[PDB]
Design a binder for this molecule. Structure first.
Ligand code: HEM
Length: 123
């Protein structure tokens, strides 16, 4: 069920999260959304998105998603391109840690799932 289990333990999860966080930090398309976010929240956010994309959506009610990103949408110009960039960053991270291509496509399908995307984007 858990992220822990699907990736195979604490060290695997830590690797995924740290590499994903590193990549987002360096991605000029989306870095400025985290401008007013301390680095603890920044890393927690990537662990959240990662948790979501591996099928732990349970914690990410669309109504919570809609409120949590409202200021990004209204004041930072958050849009589809940004949303897609975060998913692409995740799939690039997993590939570089040798996650099977069929498993990457599985997480691609959850990461880019339409109803959660509409909620985050306040559409
Ligand atoms: C389904 C996709 C995503 C999920 C599941 C997700 C989840 C979360 C969660 C749980 C929070 C709330 C944290 C809290 O209450 O303190 C949050 C906050 C935030 N998310 Fe997302 N998010 C998603 C997509 C995005 C995208 C596309 C961006 C930026 C390009 C983004 C940027 C942020 C920002 C800046 C915050 C506020 C700061 C923070 O708490 O890190 N999120 N996100």
């Amino acid at each position: 069920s858990t992220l822990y289990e699907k990736l195979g333990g604490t060290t695997a999860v830590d690797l995924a999260v740290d590499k994903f966080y590193e990549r987002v930090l360096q991605d000029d398309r989306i870095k400025h959304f985290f401008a007013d976010v301390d680095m603890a929240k920044q890393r927690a956010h990537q662990k959240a998105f990662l948790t979501y994309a591996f099928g732990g959506t349970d914690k990410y009610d669309g109504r919570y998603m809609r409120e949590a990103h409202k200021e990004l949408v209204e004041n930072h110009g958050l849009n589809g391109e940004h949303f897609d960039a975060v998913a692409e960053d995740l799939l690039a991270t997993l590939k570089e840690m040798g996650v099977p291509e069929d498993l990457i496509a599985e997480v691609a399908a959850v990461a880019g799932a339409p109803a959660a995307k509409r909620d985050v984007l306040n559409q």
